[PDB]
Design a protein around this ligand. Structure first.
Ligand SMILES: CCCCCCCCCCCCCCCCCC(=O)OC[C@H](COP(=O)([O-])OCC(O)COP(=O)([O-])OC[C@@H](COC(=O)CCCCCCCCCCCCCCCCC)OC(=O)CCCCCCCCCCCCCCCCC)OC(=O)CCCCCCCCCCCCCCCCC
Ligand SMILES: CCCCCCCCCCCCCCCCCC(=O)OC[C@H](COP(=O)([O-])OCC(O)COP(=O)([O-])OC[C@@H](COC(=O)CCCCCCCCCCCCCCCCC)OC(=O)CCCCCCCCCCCCCCCCC)OC(=O)CCCCCCCCCCCCCCCCC
Ligand SMILES: CC(C)=CCC/C(C)=C/CC/C(C)=C\CC/C(C)=C/CC/C(C)=C/CC/C(C)=C/CC/C(C)=C/CC/C(C)=C/CC/C(C)=C/CC1=C(C)C(=O)c2ccccc2C1=O
Ligand SMILES: CC(C)=CCC/C(C)=C/CC/C(C)=C\CC/C(C)=C/CC/C(C)=C/CC/C(C)=C/CC/C(C)=C/CC/C(C)=C/CC/C(C)=C/CC1=C(C)C(=O)c2ccccc2C1=O
Ligand SMILES: CC(C)=CCC/C(C)=C/CC/C(C)=C\CC/C(C)=C/CC/C(C)=C/CC/C(C)=C/CC/C(C)=C/CC/C(C)=C/CC/C(C)=C/CC1=C(C)C(=O)c2ccccc2C1=O
Ligand SMILES: CC(C)=CCC/C(C)=C/CC/C(C)=C\CC/C(C)=C/CC/C(C)=C/CC/C(C)=C/CC/C(C)=C/CC/C(C)=C/CC/C(C)=C/CC1=C(C)C(=O)c2ccccc2C1=O
Ligand SMILES: CC(C)=CCC/C(C)=C\CC/C(C)=C/CC/C(C)=C/CC/C(C)=C/CC/C(C)=C\CC/C(C)=C\CC/C(C)=C\CC/C(C)=C\CC1=C(C)C(=O)c2ccccc2C1=O
Ligand SMILES: CCCCCCCC/C=C\CCCCCCCC(=O)OC[C@H](COP(=O)(O)OCCN)OC(=O)CCCCCCCCCCCCCCC
Ligand code: HEM
Ligand code: HEM
Ligand code: FES
Lengths: 76, 93, 186, 139, 524, 105
């Protein structure tokens, strides 16, 4: 495999156990973008826009925290 | 839409059905006696009283709706029994 | 170490006390609305059939003795006498349940319903929960018999038998109280 | 097991006295006579404490002192083998989910959902009870 | 008889291919019967459809009922709807047969999906069996469309609405071909006079023949490329451990077939499905709150319900919104058969495999599959918007938005949880390998320590602590009772005991037998 | 038929100001999303709902879509009365009816 540690995943030599982190980062960013676009052509009402922006901000905050901590050395 | 719903027609009697379609309660259109004659109304009343109280000739009515309860019953009864029979007949490890 | 007083026994006894409090709530419900109904408080379309309520009560009282014979057999570690006495107790409990249901059918046919009056409400709410407790006891009997079938007989199995035994005894005493309150005192 | 039974007996005494006093003082001096609700509640509270204290007395009068009942006892006295204590199990969460299904079906009046919840409850309780008694697969 | 067999030998002389097939070995794992479920459902479907074809008339010409079902007397219907009403109400057994048919169709679809789940999560699709994965995927698509065409033959209101909406109105909107395809398929505008006979031909001859041929090729590949197996004591990449065909495997297969036919008969007798008489004949002016095609087509309906209205208008042209639904459907249909090749390209693993994987040991693939199942379940729940909103007191707009947001936020959450859960199961296995099985018994150790009395699976050291073992891809025991620990009650029947001599003899015989079985499998 | 009390909350699409005969409006019944009958008329909300994929149209705002997967408004028919007092059509639809395609609405 491309590589993880058997101290992280015990059965790392028995199956696929690693997916790159850029995939998950850009996937979170794309999901946030989709949630934001999903209010184009707003039909009457705005209570759902608050849920949309809330979830988009939460996803962006999670991705940013993970990226920052991996960059400064507190992860890996 | 947005809250409101249309009720079940089982607990209504004939005079109640007649007055319902004569007066048109909230969000229900009012059916004038000139656009829907009294005889047509009586035929509709007979039809609903038959459709609400006739026994189903095919087994347990699964809620009166379409294939959503049927798929639920499939997954919960038939597939569960088949998988239990497979667990009994076969081995595991 | 061995802390001789059994643990499952204590747990079961204290839970039975809690269930007594539940039936206290039900009894308070029933006793209220009887002090309000004036004169002939059980309404006229209500007539209690004493030709059906005494036999099933006797059958339940006999269930108690058969279950005690079962636990006696349990304490000397043979499974087969236990199984026999507990199957007999299960059959008698099923007979009691069927008698109660038939009496319900006959009582609804020409009279009392839950939405009909206050007497029907208190009557059905007080006796149907006891019926549900009897059905729970029957399910417990079945589960215990299957567990005795599926492995070697041990003191843990004997303890399970004993605790099911006095759960059944609690149910019988509660029925005695309810029957004496509803049919005789009135 | 003397102190536990004594505790429950003290509670029983107080509850019985309060029950009888309230019953009499409402039979007289009250608007419509006996109150019929607090009276029943106090009577069966007395019954609760009575059942528990009686069981504790009856198991105590046929018992010899345990090391926890005994001062001047050493830790070497309790050496031995305690009972069986269940390690990991996943059946409680399934029992909870079954009961929640039945409860939602009772809140929203859906008899099919009530029936499904009761069946799930039976199945998960059987799973819990038979967990340490199933034997090996007989092939 | 001796003479008949002797003559069969002197005439055809198989006697070696026959032996070769009688000594074929099959593994015995409960999950290897999920394809048999689908096969038996298909056989029952064949029989009941052949029965049904003797009474059906697939015409769209109009008539008046004048039959036994009085609430429909005098109504203008088609000949197909009248044929279905006649099957239901005037043939002795026809309602029973068509209910068996519809229940068998639903069981067919469900069994195919559960079998696909097993194959995917165990990894049986790798190098030697990729073509069989592709064949199975084609079979799944064909079964979906065959059932869809099936429940549209009795031209009633609900099935006609589903036909109209999905088939007609999504085909009509496709970018360039569009109306040309719609008119080639319908002979003109939507309600024509050839649609029901054309679908009847397609449904009783073409798709059943193609499905039979593909099932034959599939089973032939499974028979000649031997079956996979799970890692275990005597199991190797080069052998097959199990039972031979002749005495045992055929017996078990036939018993399972009979049991499945029994279940289908019970539920085709006791549960009512598709009561077309409560509906009416299809008419373009009437509608009902009824919707929701059969459950295997519900994800397309839910996608059409929760997709947002994004359209494009440029020079004298139009691209409507259902084009998105069609595109996503085709994208799924393309990505399903390509997964083995995509995964081998990504992981760089081009080896041969005969041993299966446990789902906990492949966390990334298990999380991918869980994410896909979550997406499917969201789309399937979004199809019953109105029923959910009516029965569980929720707003219709609320259910729509809940589906729209869940479709994007739930699958990655399920992915994360599945990954961590598989790793936790692995760590549990590692703890059981390092120490012994936990027995549940506690001691007090006179100086006041509490210990747990583990039970080792191998050799111990001189200090008594077990020596740690290595993982080998096989499950590990977690309960003491699943090993023979406290078992074998008295040997009576249920109420009266046998004799002690018989009990002891049976106990000793069983113990010796199981010991020799485990020895014969572990030593060799 | 709209109550005479409102009759001032109508918005009257740009080219269809004279398409109504007083309080009668007569829109089409074929939904513009996938062709299902848009039958559910809520009279005190003045809303049109289709039971296929749950689009909603504002009967007081030229049947403009306000919720669901639909994107275009429902086509309106011109109506009038004849010399005998019967309601008749005052022409044809000014746009195609039903779902859209590559060529136009
Ligand atoms: C020093 C600390 C002090 C600093 C203070 C703050 C500093 C910055 C603040 C900034 C903002 C603050 C807000 C954050 C809140 C902080 C709290 C917190 O995080 O938890 C603490 C802490 C977080 O730990 P951590 O330090 O962040 O360490 C993280 C890991 O160790 C290591 O993480 P990792 O490297 O392993 O990455 C994990 C994650 C990566 O991390 C992330 O980047 C975040 C991801 C979030 C969004 C991702 C969504 C992606 C969606 C796209 C869809 C697919 C593409 O990966 C994922 O699993 C995400 C799943 C995405 C799935 C995508 C797979 C794609 C497959 C291919 C599909 C292709 C087609 C698509 C189609 C789908 C249709 C079928 O929690 C714990 O440690 C344990 C919790 C204990 C119990 C708590 C539960 C209480 C419950 C209450 C009741
Ligand atoms: C709303 C519900 C809709 C209903 C759906 C349809 C219902 C039809 C039944 C379901 C499937 C039919 C089963 C056919 C096999 C029957 C033959 C048999 O009993 O052999 C014993 C068989 C042991 O055979 P074995 O191959 O030697 O395995 C020995 C191992 O030690 C195995 O030991 P183990 O450690 O692996 O664990 C044993 C495990 C094994 O049991 C199972 O796996 C059965 C459940 C599988 C269904 C699929 C689950 C998927 C859910 C996700 O069972 C449990 O963990 C406890 C569950 C309690 C089962 C009985 C409760 C019935 C409540 C009825 C209300 O165990 C069972 O199957 C007993 C379950 C069925 C009870 C008998 C019928 C009672 C009917 C109810 C009366 C009213
Ligand atoms: C789900 C949506 C969001 C509504 C949930 C209901 C809501 C009001 C309360 C949920 C509580 C929750 C949020 C907190 C945790 C509670 C706990 C975890 C368990 C509660 C979850 C519930 C009870 C599970 C049911 C969820 C539901 C949407 C599944 C739908 C199943 C399908 C629709 C049944 C179809 C069906 C129907 C509709 C019939 O009418 C019918 C009639 C006669 C026979 C059969 C059927 C039948 O199968
Ligand atoms: C009529 C109307 C009312 C409804 C029509 C419904 C219709 C579908 C009825 C179908 C009847 C159908 C033939 C029932 C199945 C009969 C079963 C298989 C009985 C035999 C099972 C059992 C008792 C004996 C063991 C079976 C084995 C040993 C012999 C036969 C056998 C069979 C049957 C296999 O399927 C098989 C598959 C793969 C390898 C080998 C075998 C095999 O040896
Ligand atoms: C190479 C290697 C590196 C990887 C290979 C995989 C790779 C990523 C593939 C590229 C992606 C791309 C090629 C796919 C684009 C998506 C698709 C194929 C475009 C259109 C597909 C679609 C129009 C055809 C599917 C059939 C259906 C959907 C057409 C319309 C349609 C019809 C015709 C129905 O009969 C119908 C009946 C009931 C419900 C709905 C429908 C329906 O939507
Ligand atoms: C595992 C598999 C899906 C991985 C595929 C890999 C992937 C890369 C392929 C690409 C496909 C694309 C990208 C996404 C797929 C998502 C979707 C659009 C796929 C369309 C068709 C698809 C292939 C069907 C797969 C669905 C899945 C495999 C079914 C297996 C379900 C499980 C394992 C059955 C276990 C037994 C079961 C839980 C017993 C209890 C019953 C439960 C409640 C079943 C749940 C349930 C189900 C499943 C219903 O379908 C349903 C329908 C109507 C009403 C109710 C229900 C319902 O309650
Ligand atoms: C792909 C799909 C799933 C994606 C989605 C598509 C869509 C959404 C779903 C489907 C929807 C619809 C629109 C699909 C429509 C499909 C449509 C209905 C397809 C129907 C199939 C098709 C049109 C049928 C026509 C083709 C067919 C009839 C021709 C094949 C001919 C047949 C099968 C062969 C029969 C003869 C056979 C038994 C003998 C074989 C010959 C043998 C092997 C050699 C002959 C031979 C032998 C054997 C000797 O021993 C011998 C000895 C001595 C001398 C000479 C000979 C000798 O010549
Ligand atoms: C709460 C439990 C209440 C009582 C339990 C004991 C049951 C006692 C049963 C005797 C009732 C009776 O016989 O009364 C006949 C009446 C005549 O009604 P009607 O107007 O004339 O006709 C109109 C008929 N369609 O029908 C009824 O109320 C039928 C009563 C329904 C049966 C009780 C439901 C049990 C469900 C328990 C919930 C468990 C959920 C678990 C979650 C925690
Ligand atoms: C192989 C997969 C098949 C599937 C998934 C399937 C599915 C269905 C379904 C769901 C129906 C509607 C049943 C109802 O009326 O409620 C149906 C109808 C019908 N099927 Fe099938 N079927 C299959 C194979 C066959 C075969 C092989 C035949 C004939 C040889 C057949 C003949 C018929 C006929 C004639 C009808 C219409 C009769 C009626 O609706 O009552 N089917 N099919
Ligand atoms: C009508 C549809 C199908 C039928 C009748 C069917 C039947 C079967 C049967 C009986 C087996 C052997 C026993 C077993 O492994 O359960 C099998 C194996 C297999 N199936 Fe299917 N299946 C169908 C659909 C699919 C699908 C959707 C896939 C994906 C698939 C892929 C495979 C593979 C790769 C194997 C070989 C697994 C192995 O040898 O370990 N099949 N099929
Ligand atoms: S058809 Fe009316 S909303 Fe889709």
């Amino acid at each position: 495999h491309t590589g993880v540690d058997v101290e992280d995943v015990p059965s790392a030599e028995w199956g696929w156990s690693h997916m790159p982190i850029g995939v998950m980062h850009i996937g979170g960013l794309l999901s946030a973008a989709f949630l934001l676009v999903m209010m184009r052509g707003n039909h009457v009402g705005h209570v759902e826009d608050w849920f949309l922006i809330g979830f988009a901000a939460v996803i962006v905050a999670l991705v940013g925290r993970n990226w920052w901590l991996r960059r400064r050395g507190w992860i890996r | 839409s947005s809250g409101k719903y249309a009720p079940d027609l089982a607990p209504a009697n004939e005079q109640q059905i007649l007055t319902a379609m004569l007066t048109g309660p909230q969000n229900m259109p009012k059916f004038s006696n000139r656009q829907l004659s009294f005889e047509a109304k009586k035929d509709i009343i007979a039809y609903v009283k038959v459709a609400t109280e006739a026994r189903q000739p095919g087994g347990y009515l699964l809620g009166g709706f379409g294939p959503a309860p049927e798929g639920m019953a499939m997954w919960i009864i038939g597939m569960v029994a088949a998988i239990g029979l497979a667990l009994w007949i076969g081995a595991r490890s | 170490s061995l802390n001789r007083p059994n643990m499952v026994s204590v747990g079961t006894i204290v839970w039975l006390s809690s269930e007594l409090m539940f039936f206290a709530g039900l009894f308070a419900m029933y006793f209220t609305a009887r002090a309000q109904a004036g004169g002939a408080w059980p309404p006229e379309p209500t007539e209690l059939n004493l030709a059906l309520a005494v036999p099933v009560t006797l059958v339940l009282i006999a269930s108690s003795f058969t279950c005690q014979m079962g636990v006696f057999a349990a304490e000397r570690g043979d499974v087969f006498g236990l199984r026999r006495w507990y199957v007999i107790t299960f059959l008698m409990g099923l007979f009691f349940v069927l008698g109660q249901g038939y009496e319900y059918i006959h009582l609804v046919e020409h009279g009392t319903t839950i939405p009909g009056s206050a007497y029907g409400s208190v009557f059905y709410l007080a006796t149907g929960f006891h019926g549900l407790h009897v059905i729970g006891g029957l399910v417990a009997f079945v589960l215990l018999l299957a567990r005795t079938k599926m492995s070697k007989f041990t003191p843990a199995q004997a303890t399970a038998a004993i605790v099911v035994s006095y759960y059944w005894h609690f149910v019988d005493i509660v029925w005695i109280a309810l029957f004496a309150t509803i049919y005789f005192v009135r | 097991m003397h102190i536990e039974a004594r505790l429950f007996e003290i509670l029983t005494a107080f509850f019985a006295l309060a029950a009888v006093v309230y019953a009499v003082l409402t039979a007289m001096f009250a608007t419509g006579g006996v109150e019929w609700a607090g009276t029943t509640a106090l009577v069966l509270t007395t019954g609760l404490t009575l059942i528990t204290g009686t069981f504790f007395r009856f198991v105590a009068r046929r018992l010899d002192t345990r090391p926890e009942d005994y001062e001047d006892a050493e830790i070497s006295d309790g050496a031995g083998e305690l009972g069986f204590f269940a390690p990991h199990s996943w059946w409680p969460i399934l029992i909870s989910l079954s009961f929640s299904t039945a409860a939602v079906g009772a809140a929203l009046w859906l008899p099919w959902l009530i029936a499904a919840g009761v069946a799930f409850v039976i199945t998960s309780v059987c799973g819990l009870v038979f967990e340490y008694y199933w034997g090996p697969e007989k092939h | 008889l001796a003479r008949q067999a002797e003559d069969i030998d002197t005439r055809y002389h198989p006697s070696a291919a026959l032996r070769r097939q009688l000594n074929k070995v099959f593994p015995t794992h409960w999950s290897f019967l999920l394809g048999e479920i689908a096969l038996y459902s298909f056989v029952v479907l064949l029989i009941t459809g052949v029965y049904l074809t003797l009474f059906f008339d697939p015409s769209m010409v109009d008539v008046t009922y004048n039959g036994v079902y009085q609430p429909l007397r005098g109504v203008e219907m088609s000949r197909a709807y009248q044929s279905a009403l006649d099957i239901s109400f005037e043939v002795r057994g026809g309602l029973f047969v068509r209910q068996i048919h519809h229940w068998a169709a639903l069981m067919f679809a469900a069994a195919i999906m559960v079998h696909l789940a097993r194959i995917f999560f165990t990894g049986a699709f790798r190098r030697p069996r990729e073509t069989n994965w592709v064949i199975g995927s084609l079979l799944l698509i064909l079964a979906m469309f065959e059932g869809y065409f099936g429940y549209s033959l009795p031209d009633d209101l609900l099935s006609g609405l589903g036909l109209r909406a999905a088939l007609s109105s999504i085909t009509l909107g496709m970018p360039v071909i569009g109306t040309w395809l719609h008119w080639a398929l319908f002979g003109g505008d939507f309600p024509g006079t050839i649609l029901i006979p054309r679908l009847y031909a397609l449904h009783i001859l073409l798709l059943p023949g193609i499905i039979l041929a593909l099932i034959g090729l599939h089973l032939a590949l499974v028979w000649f490329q031997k079956h996979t197996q799970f890692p275990g004591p005597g199991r190797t990449e080069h052998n097959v451990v199990g039972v031979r065909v002749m005495p045992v495997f055929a017996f078990k297969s036939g018993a399972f077939f009979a049991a499945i036919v029994g279940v289908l008969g019970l539920m085709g007798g006791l549960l009512q499905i598709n009561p077309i008489w409560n509906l009416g004949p299809y008419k373009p002016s009437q509608v009902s709150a009824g919707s929701q095609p059969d459950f295997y087509m519900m994800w397309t309906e839910g996608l059409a319900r929760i997709w947002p209205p994004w359209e494009f208008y440029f020079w004298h042209h139009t691209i409507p919104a259902p084009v998105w639904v069609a595109v996503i459907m085709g994208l799924v249909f393309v990505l399903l058969p390509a997964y083995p090749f995509l995964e081998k390209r990504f992981t760089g693993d081009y080896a041969h495999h005969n041993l299966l994987q446990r789902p906990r040991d492949v966390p990334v693939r298990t999380a991918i599959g869980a994410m896909a199942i979550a997406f499917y379940m969201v789309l399937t729940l979004a199809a019953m918007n109105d029923i959910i909103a009516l029965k569980f007191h929720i707003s219709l707009n609320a259910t729509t938005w809940i589906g729209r947001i869940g479709m994007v936020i739930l699958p990655p959450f399920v992915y994360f949880i599945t990954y961590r859960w598989c790793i936790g199961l692995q760590r549990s296995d590692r703890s059981v390998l390092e120490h012994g099985v936990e027995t549940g018994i506690i001691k007090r150790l006179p100086h006041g320590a509490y210990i747990e009395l583990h039970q080792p699976l191998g050799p111990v050291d001189e200090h008594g602590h077990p020596i740690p073992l290595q993982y080998q891809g096989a499950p590990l025991p977690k309960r003491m009772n699943k090993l023979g620990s406290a078992g074998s009650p008295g040997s009576g029947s249920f109420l009266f005991a046998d004799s002690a001599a018989e009990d002891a003899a049976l106990r000793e015989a069983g113990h010796a037998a199981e010991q020799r079985a485990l020895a014969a499998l572990r030593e060799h | 038929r709209i109550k005479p009390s409102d009759l001032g909350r109508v918005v009257k699409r740009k080219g269809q100001e004279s398409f109504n005969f007083g309080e009668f409006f007569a829109f089409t019944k074929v939904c513009s999303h996938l062709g299902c009958p848009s039958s559910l008329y809520e009279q005190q909300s003045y809303r049109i709902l289709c039971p296929c994929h749950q689009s909603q149209f504002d009967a007081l705002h030229f049947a403009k879509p306000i919720f669901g997967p639909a994107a275009r408004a429902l086509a309106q028919l011109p109506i009038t009365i004849d010399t005998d007092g019967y309601l008749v059509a005052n022409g044809d639809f000014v746009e195609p009816v039903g779902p859209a395609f590559w060529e136009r609405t």
